Amino acid sequence: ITQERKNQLINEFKTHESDTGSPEVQIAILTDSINNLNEHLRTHKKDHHSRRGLLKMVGKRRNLLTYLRNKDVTRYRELINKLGLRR
RNA sequence: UCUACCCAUGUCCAGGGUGAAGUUCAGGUAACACUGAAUGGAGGCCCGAACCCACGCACGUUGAAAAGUGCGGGGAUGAGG
Ligand SMILES: [Mg+2]
Ligand SMILES: [Mg+2]
Ligand SMILES: [Mg+2]
């Protein structure tokens, strides 16, 4: 467990001090879980059930990224640079 | 001392072509795949002298020669000479 990743990408674009539901925070946590799960699948190549989990996370993260991009174009660009995404 | 195979140690193979893997960059996707370009220089790879071979024909047949010559021919970085 890491609230580290919360308090980092809360404060970058914080609505509240104890913001949790910011797209920033969500996308960041998704990015952390995605990347963790990828390295599981490097080892456990034929864990297909878990891999469907990955594809759902990826789809959530994409949809939240498309949401920012349409909402706040600058705020989107700051998030993808810090996480190191492309889209 | 010919020749067959082997062992040790040397050496030879003008030139030209083709463009494997890999790599890089770009694209590419959540990751990979995958795509393009450049690079790269593989091969009992290609064309072709030396060299090695001996497919066809002619000639020769008391020969220039007890196996050759002429004109073409095959291999030519290899299980090579
Ligand atoms: Mg050859
Ligand atoms: Mg040749
Ligand atoms: Mg000849």
Curated annotation (Swiss-Prot):
The gene is rpsO. One of the primary rRNA binding proteins, it binds directly to 16S rRNA where it helps nucleate assembly of the platform of the 30S subunit by binding and bridging several RNA helices of the 16S rRNA. InterPro entries: Ribosomal_uS15, Ribosomal_uS15_bac-type, uS15_NS1_RNA-bd_sf. PROSITE patterns: RIBOSOMAL_S15. GO terms for cellular component: cytosolic small ribosomal subunit. GO terms for biological process: translation. Residues 1-19 have a biased composition (Basic and acidic residues). GO terms for molecular function: rRNA binding; structural constituent of ribosome. It comes from the Bacteria. It comes from Bacillus subtilis (strain 168). This is Small ribosomal subunit protein uS15. Pfam families: Ribosomal_S15.
